[PDB]
């Protein structure tokens, strides 16, 4: 351990995705990534990458002819689909030396919808794609950051303010963007950033996750998910509807949708309606939709919860690999 | 040099207009002032500013009347910005900033055009610019400062955050005397000024994606705190927005609101480091919809000689990139704002 | 009678709630009111409300410690459910002595969707719980209004303009706010502000209520509704459909729907499709949703049409006590 | 006392400018013009204004050339509102308001700012304050009408419309010796001014929603007809807004729309009765969009001595609460509008 | 054929109406009018059109007793309903002695969505009721225009310009309005403005019209169009479904839309997304339609896909009559 | 007469303001110019106009030290518009207008208000008016340039285009010295003028739908090239706009948007042919929502004696109409533009 931290802005895109800056190489090629909880491998598209795919034309790609620190691999990769290399990488005035995926098979689903250019895997190294050592445990490697830890604060979208969109801090975590103190819980198995879940109530009832459940925090996706079954019975309770692709309320009676907690470590943690319905909108005449979605994750992970970004705007969250466990603190 | 360091809070008005408060006079009059390396007088307005500037009907008046302070001086000057312009006299008195007092001469401003004053929510103006710059020749605040032998390094320091709806967001910071690590991290890059007097560097290239498309041969950027936003001349700037898509309106640059987060990379070769912003570093959005428009922080700027043709680097770039002025060396840093 | 009229301006929120304000107590505490000729009681929300009910937290609450003309009753109540008070109520300059309900039991649905804090009842005794005098029985009672009558006005809505959202005149009716004269329907029995349909046609027939049916005139209820097989068959003949919540057409097409006729007392009340559908848009890419929904009222006052909001904005309604008729003029 | 009452009938442009008709000179040149209380002064735009003046080229201007009954003075003045000043010269001509008519002193106003001016719908104004406040000591016209003895009361009321998009709304209604029994209902309630010269009575509180946060220890209130707004001291005003969960923007206040309707009421307690407004009387509700602002109808004033500091109740107020001034007995009376 | 060309300027209503005006009668009354190449007739609603048609309370009537180059025919029609008459009509500074319906039955389906008044048919005599010589004939037959050709430019609708809505030229084509060179496809036989199409590929893979089948070119539908069958099929392929009226997509998810190409003479005419999808929005919280519909066009002209606005918008069309061949050009 | 004809182009700035490049002095200072025939003065912004202008600041400024063809003459003028004034002095140069270069006097404008002229893209004005109404008896430009005889006829000829978001699309087009037949159809149709001296001539009446409701018995109309609307009195446009149904705001009328489609056609008739502009062609149609205004391009404008009372065509009407202008007739031509 050392004394410093670092930190990365992220730009909020709608809610659903949120991303920053790193940097590919020398000289540095400028990234936008999202930061992943739910992955292990770091990616980014290659300038190899066909414009077959319209995905590949959309986005940033990384030319290893133009970096004198480009070391070549190849060994094939499926994470998006290409092949290993190794580059230094830029992250907020960090710099490590790391193996990641140049792509150069890049389907229109679902990245022709990412704002982002690619991929810093935040899991761990049982999860990676060719067991590449993961940029985290390269940085904890050089002994420079104050604690094994690093933390999300994902701000809500404003159209009023030019605001953070959300910060990931590497090293501790800013207590500018929390308020009280942090309670953790531990991971069932290191590995994998998934908790323990006692509980999922809405308002006055625990109906779901009776007998216990498993909860991933995922930094990577949108939303609130559990089962296609247990989201089911979760909107049938909400009185939330499927419209067709997603559930919908009356915008009207968003405000009077119970409050759902979910049960972790002994706390409840509970969001308002205000916390997992998008009000676009208020009107009698006008549906709104929710943060929280069906996903049905295969094994070995799932099936599983993931609490994800809807989650993380209420809770700040504190991955802590010194001691495996997730910290939450609210806000702010 | 001494051993103190001093710093000032900057409220953050709509990421165009940051500034702090300064007090002048005894007892103090405080008058909230834009810090602006792009210049070197100080000027608030003057109570004895004809009401019929409304902008004097809703701003701050100094008044010398309320001062045991103030030394007359009387001097006529005019203070042109690349925006407007004011007019007054000078006057000397007491002003306070950050905890530091210093005797300064300022203009006492008699003369504010309601555009573009009336959409200031500043007062005044603390031109943090060289004296070779200063109108009248008047010393400049930092130089006074510097004299008083009080400060750690002849150097001076901006932090501008993102705007907030919170409150207990700060909306940037200056320090006077070195720099605050809590808002900055990687090393500060270094890049010589031109020249002693402005605040202005050499730059390299401007890349807007994937091109070099502009500045080829080796441009200007001058540093400046006092400016909203990064601006070229009206040639680079027509160019640089035809790569972008966006349309020209009498005073800005726009695209359709939907098209804002996919618009491409800027970069500015500094020293030898690519700086570098997203589209939601420049881009005010404010709305996903095709049906509005969302307004660049990139303007057409055509600053006249002897200091221009020259880019300015301003709000829009320092939000990225922590500041630091440096007097003694006769350089600019530049680190990663955090 | 005396020759006194007193008025209170409405709010108008989204053109569905309607409200305004009345003072219970020495001094007045100030509430928001929906005048309702669909209820018979007074009420407004407690001080010993709890904050369990989250309604009770986001509305104003009476506190009859407050006020030194409050005398205490106890005697419960199910309107909402709470206990029987007194006090003095003023309404437009009017101050009464009024027996209310104070309701401590309040759940979030509906009165969570109330921008209103209350009700005060503008229905007869006949329907009061506890036989309660209703409010206008005992101003009537003090000879200072003009006619034993009450009127509204329902003002549309507006975006550019701060207009006035409605008015109810105790003791006459406003002439500002209606052209041309009133006819009367005369009640089917008192006790109920209900009358007789003679039929409710669309355009170029009379589809429904032939052979009579019932018309409950009622300034709480927010649309014009019909029972659920009325309601059905109504939106067959306009092509609107069931979106999920509500029945909607295309925006587009809403000016092209028929008008809808209703027959009461030998004449026929028109609207058009601008009186019925929210153009909340006007695009071919757009649903609409109209002012017209199904509700099924229970005996013995149903099954029974209620005209409410939808149908007072078209026509000004007087309320006729003396003479157990309902008076309607066009507008204005 | 006489035994006449004359209405003039007001326009509401927008819920923030409500004027009447007058006519001066002979024959009659006709202008658009605000009656206020809050100033003691008769003017309108001048012919002599340069038309340099925009706020000229856009307004009916008094021409002394084109009437025979003009008496020339061409005493200097300056006249200063909270929001503009103007600026110009005596004169005295016929003055017909409701069919009163009236030999008056007025200011023909040769300088006529932008900003406010060209956003002003009327001409002129009619100050319906006391010749104590009077610029120039000049008569003002209220004065001048008592004088002519046909009057049936010293007194004047005011009744300020809600807005509408229907062309037979009345906009407002001033009633000069009397009040319009149409536009109240219930009793008028009775505060005395502080003191004679002003129309300005002692506040003993300002609550919002279930808290008397403001006032507490008693205040000032100006009945100002000429204010569009409730304004209060700019200390009192953050706080205020603060409760409200408002957003402060340069020149107002605002919520987001969709939390609007919800916001709490606002009591002022003026002579022993309690003077409440709801949200819908100080919103203007423009949309109830979270994703647009909506601007309050209460501003930040800070309003000099003497008369100040004091919280000036405008037309959100009045629209609510019809409002007699009473000259005999020096008295402002409140009845609820109709 | 002449030197002449004339121009007549269109009105973009919402993507889904284009309209300019000519004039009637001596001297000239003016009306709104769809220029169709789906229909051979040209008429407008008459002032004997009863007011009971609330059609014909919202359109320009013509007045024939204003008319002193009117003359009688009074010869039924049924277009719309009601009888031929003959007048000089202006069109882009072209004047014609011409015979069109006057339309008196004019039911409120469709033509109350209507924010034209009229029609000018410019299909062929074989289609026209009464065989009325169409107009284009009859300004062929006046030996002025430079080729026997007319072209259609549709354009974009924009909320942030007032631009134009589009153009058709008589007598040739505007290079302003298209790019490169016009590809010709021949007429399958005289009389109706349908060309062969020999497939509709969705991104990678011809799914439809494969062995063939029948394209209409028509200025007149605001659509692309097929049978109820082909659409379904299309938008199955697409991951769009049917709203209620209409087919969507959430509005993020059409950018990631396959492109659709038209085999027309040998060539790919291809639509990207953007092209066929009303970006309405962009968000992932809303709905967005498709500008291609089902239409069931029964015979003899189909079953038959329609090439409609949302082609036309894509490529500036020429219609050659000189050679009963339909060219395209890209945009512009 | 000669065998020239001359073109200049126009860019079209949002539908309001059309104006074209001219060039002044040695070497040619570049000014853009709006060609108007409602007033007979070439102007443009001086370098010795004031920075306290902020006009001056955001604007091209001629510079006669920078002119070695420049004379001076320095007689003083004041121009007056309908919508603003300038101030300033005479001076002579050469002017290059489309290839023309001319001789010619111009006013070197040094009073320039902010209100309206930061709102203007345009820098100055070319007056295509006749000497009859110029200030200063200045000799117009036209006339300098049939002075020279290269001109083919002594007319010149306007067309106006649609706005567009395409950068290919052109804004307008002048042509001197005849018309070009690629941007009208049809056969010009000729009204003369009421007299020589003012581009003004007979309107025979105004219909709005299905009503001759406006200048029944014959009226003026002023066909104005610098006026970006049709406009008529206050008294007539309250009458055209009660028929529309159309709100009336500071500055303009609007109609919610949702309406604006289906607003009835108005006609007027000039010369014997009626001139129909449908709701497309005078409604700026920038959404089809309820909850939104729209404007229209009619406003009320009183035209003060000897010109007015006058209707005026300016844009609105002249983007459905070419528009030539007859020196050697004293008529005005209208063809379809195309
Ligand atoms: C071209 C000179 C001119 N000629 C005529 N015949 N009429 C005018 N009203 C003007 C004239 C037009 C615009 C301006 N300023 C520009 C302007 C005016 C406005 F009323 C609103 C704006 F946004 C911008 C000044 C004078």
Same mark, same amino acid.
């Given at each position: 351990l050392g004394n410093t931290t670092s930190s990365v802005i992220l730009t909020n895109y709608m809610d659903t995705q949120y991303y920053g800056e790193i940097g590919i190489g020398t000289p540095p090629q400028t990234f936008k990534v999202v930061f992943d909880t739910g992955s292990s491998n770091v990616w980014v598209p290659s300038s190899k990458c066909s414009r077959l795919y319209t $995905?590949?034309?959309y986005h940033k790609l990384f030319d290893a002819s133009d970096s004198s620190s480009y070391k070549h691999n190849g060994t094939e990769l499926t994470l998006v689909s290409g092949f290993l290399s190794q580059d230094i990488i830029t992250v907020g005035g960090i710099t490590v030396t790391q193996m990641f995926g140049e792509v150069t098979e890049m389907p229109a689903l679902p990245f022709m919808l990412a704002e982002f250019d690619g991929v810093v895997g935040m899991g761990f190294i049982e999860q990676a794609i060719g067991r590449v050592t993961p940029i985290f445990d390269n940085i904890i %490697?050089?002994?420079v950051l104050k604690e094994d830890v690093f933390s999300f604060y994902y701000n809500r979208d404003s159209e009023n303010s030019? %605001?953070?969109?959300?910060? /990931?801090?590497?090293g501790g975590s800013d207590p500018q963007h929390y308020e009280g103190n942090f309670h953790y819980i531990n991971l069932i198995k290191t @590995?994998?950033?998934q908790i323990q879940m006692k509980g999922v109530s809405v308002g006055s009832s625990t109906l779901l996750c009776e007998d216990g459940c498993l909860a991933l925090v995922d930094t990577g996706a949108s939303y609130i998910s559990g089962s296609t079954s247990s989201i089911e019975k979760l909107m049938e $309770?909400? @009185?939330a509807k499927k419209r067709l692709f997603d559930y919908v309320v009356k915008c009207?009676?968003?405000?009077?949708?119970?409050? /759902? %907690?979910?049960?972790? @470590?002994?706390?409840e943690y509970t969001l308002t309606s205000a916390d997992y319905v998008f009000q676009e909108s208020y009107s009698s005449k006008k549906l709104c939709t929710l943060a929280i979605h069906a996903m049905d994750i295969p094994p070995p992970t799932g099936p599983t919860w993931a609490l994800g970004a809807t989650f993380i705007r209420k809770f700040y969250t504190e991955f802590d690999r010194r001691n495996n466990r997730i910290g939450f $603190?609210? $806000?702010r």
């Open positions: $995905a590949c034309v %490697s050089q002994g030019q %605001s953070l969109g959300g910060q /990931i801090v590497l @590995g994998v950033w $309770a909400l @009185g009207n009676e968003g405000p009077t949708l119970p409050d /759902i %907690s979910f049960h972790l @470590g002994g706390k $603190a609210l $806000a």
